[PDB]
Ligand binder design. Structure first.
Ligand code: B12
Ligand SMILES: CN(CC[C@H](N)C(=O)O)C[C@H]1O[C@@H](n2cnc3c(N)ncnc32)[C@H](O)[C@@H]1O
Ligand SMILES: N[C@@H](Cc1c[nH]c2ccccc12)C(=O)O
Ligand code: SF4
Length: 542
């Protein structure tokens, strides 16, 4: 048999197409395998029926599950998804004896812990298209898997990784894991394949990857480890081919899925040049209606980059400025060498250049990192609000993960013998004592503590700066900083009982409605006029 099943357990709406499965499908099929996708995003109330019918009819020899999100990563909410993922995986193993392999960005933040927690045979950390093809080949040919480089295997004593070596595989480049040549085929209306048009009609977005990895080391961010610490760039022609394929299907709003679009800047500029060239070469090319949405850091973002974004069809930029105070940004928004890489001028210039070219902007602020006080919060709010960005998103509190510098540093402070100031969890019974990796018997133990307590219960560990103590009181003080005239243009942690204003797209009811109302683009691009969109919605409901 050469049949591989790939399952999407993501239930979050507004729906986001599981891009990962399209990458894996292309790689597998190019290797001569047959691939079928079971997408449960639109089968929330009857996914068991979807599983029952499939496994009675088909016999895949390997089942793959993509775990995009471990949780919402919203410190005030602490809503896990891995329990619901485990429930789906448990139903799968009930229905078949074929091995199960796990993967995903969120999966790669704690792959050893999840392999043991899900109780599955295999897992991959980072990009999986090359490792999965070798795994499927080994299973199909009846071969041993003990020599598959990069494969995490679930032994009877626990999850153990084949070296590609850090036993955790932390902070590797992972460029060798990336398929840098192929066009990732994006299909629509095809049974048992990812239905990209369905996601566009119902959620509002398409997606495009230009490069894997991030070379920086921001203390809050899981991506350098979970994705890779060096850039694996794709062929530009293959990227633009895929974008043209999406545009041809009518998927005009495309969100880049790079860690940061403007990092590895020469490749991003050469990408925009190729898009502009094809747009100019033929007016019928559907890229002429492209609406590109991107992630950026405040630097590098120069006038040439801004001109290219405008000409290629960029419609909005989300910039993770995160803060203004150098005392807070130091040791936080840093490169691998430990130095900062932007100032507030860079965000000011980014917002100005996008304004001059009719490109919308969202500026991110993350409150509660070490050093944060009420006066540091007020300083960031006053300065950020004066940028006149389209949307200004204020988040408060940090979710800790085993392979972020904050996760490691706070585990260092605990040293396995005491709790650390600022540690928080909504489900904690007493002191949260974390253990550094070197004090743990296995990767699984070091990784699991950031999500579970000793008794196996969910205990999603967060950090809140003790300087924000007299952490809900800070929310009321943060709301007071925003002028009522500016309420419409901010995202904020929501006070008691109010409608959702949070910078949180996971099951946001207003954002869930936009698809049915025909709105598209980044989920923040219509935040400003939500009052009018709601008024208009009840006008056609009557
Ligand atoms: C773009 C983006 C978004 C966009 C999506 C745009 C779109 N139309 O696709 C928006 C803004 C909507 C968004 C929303 C959210 N996101 Co987001 N987002 C990203 C980002 C930057 C790229 C995701 C992506 O598509 N990558 C490209 C795909 C192809 O790669 P991949 O999924 O990782 O897949 C590869 C590997 O993981 C592997 N793999 C994957 N699955 C499998 C399966 C198997 C079996 C195997 C073997 C291998 C394997 O192989 C794949 C091919 O190389 C990621 C970080 C990142 N750099 O990936 C964050 C990220 C995934 N998002 C994150 C979060 C928290 C969210 C939200 C929950 C935020 C919120 N509270 O609303 C929501 C969830 C929305 C949803 N419906 O699921 C977190 C996840 C953290 C965690 N621990 O899980 C990340 C890591 C951001 C961060 N730095 O913390 N997101
Ligand atoms: C959008 N981010 C930059 C783009 C990045 N590629 C990503 O998808 O996270 C920055 C924002 O992500 C959020 N964020 C990232 N990691 C965490 C985390 N561990 N806890 C809380 N918020 C986080 C913060 O709001 C931060 O301002
Ligand atoms: N603010 C992000 C989405 C988001 C919300 N909460 C998050 C937590 C972690 C990472 C991203 C997010 C955006 O506008 O695109
Ligand atoms: S915040 Fe952006 S630049 Fe910093 S590590 Fe994460 S993805 Fe890279």
């Amino acid at each position: 048999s050469r049949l591989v099943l790939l399952v999407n357990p993501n239930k979050v709406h507004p729906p986001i197409a599981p891009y990962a499965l399209d990458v894996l499908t292309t790689a597998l099929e190019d290797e001569g395998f047959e691939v079928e996708v079971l997408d449960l995003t639109f089968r929330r109330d009857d996914w068991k029926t979807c599983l029952h019918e499939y496994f009675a009819e088909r016999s895949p020899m390997l089942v793959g599950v993509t775990v995009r999100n471990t949780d919402t990563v919203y410190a005030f909410e602490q809503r896990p998804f891995v329990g619901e993922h485990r429930e789906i995986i448990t139903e799968i193993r009930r229905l078949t004896d074929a091995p199960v392999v796990g993967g995903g960005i969120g999966f790669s933040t704690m792959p050893f812990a999840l392999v043991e927690y899900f109780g599955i045979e295999y897992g991959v950390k980072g990009p999986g298209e090359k490792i999965l093809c070798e795994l499927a080949t080994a299973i199909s040919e009846g071969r041993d898997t003990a020599g598959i480089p990069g494969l995490i295997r679930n032994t009877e004593r626990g999850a153990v990784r084949v070296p590609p070596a850090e036993p955790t595989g932390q902070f590797e480049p992972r460029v060798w894991q990336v398929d840098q040549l192929s066009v990732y085929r994006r299909r629509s209306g095809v049974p048992r394949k990812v239905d990209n048009l369905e996601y566009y009609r119902r959620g509002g977005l398409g997606s495009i990857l230009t490069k894997n990895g991030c070379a920086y080391r921001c203390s809050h961010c899981v991506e350098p480890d979970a994705k890779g610490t060096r850039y694996g760039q794709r062929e530009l022609a293959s990227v633009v081919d895929e974008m043209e394929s999406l545009a041809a299907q009518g998927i005009l709003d495309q969100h880049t899925t790079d860690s940061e679009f403007n990092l590895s800047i020469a490749h991003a500029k050469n990408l925009l040049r190729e898009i502009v060239r094809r747009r100019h070469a033929d007016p019928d090319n559907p890229l002429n209606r492209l609406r590109l949405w991107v992630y950026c850091q405040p630097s590098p973002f120069d006038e040439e980059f801004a001109d290219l974004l405008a000409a290629a069809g960029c419609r909005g930029v989300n910039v993770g400025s995160d803060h203004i105070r150098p005392e807070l940004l130091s040791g936080w928004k840093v490169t691998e060498k430990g130095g900062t890489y932007y100032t507030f001028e860079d965000t000011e210039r980014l917002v100005r250049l996008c304004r001059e070219r009719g490109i919308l902007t969202m500026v991110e602020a993350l409150f509660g990192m070490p050093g944060e006080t009420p006066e540091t919060v007020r300083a960031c709010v006053d300065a950020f609000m004066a940028l006149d960005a389209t949307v200004t998103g204020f988040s408060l509190g940090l979710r800790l993960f085993p392979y972020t510098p904050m996760g490691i540093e706070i585990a260092e402070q605990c040293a396995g013998v005491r709790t650390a100031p600022g540690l928080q969890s909504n489900t904690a019974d007493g002191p949260i004592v974390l253990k550094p990796l070197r004090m743990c018997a296995s990767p699984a133990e070091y990784e699991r503590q950031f999500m579970f307590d000793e008794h196996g219960n969910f205990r999603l560990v967060c950090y809140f700066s003790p300087g924000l103590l007299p952490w809900h009181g800070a929310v009321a003080d943060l709301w007071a900083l925003i002028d009522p005239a500016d309420h419409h243009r901010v995202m904020l942690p929501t006070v008691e009982g109010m409608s959702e204003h949070d910078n949180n797209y996971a099951d946001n009811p207003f954002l869930t409605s936009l698809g049915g109302l025909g709105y598209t683009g980044a989920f923040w691009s219509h935040w400003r006029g939500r009052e009018e969109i709601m008024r208009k919605a009840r006008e056609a409901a009557a």
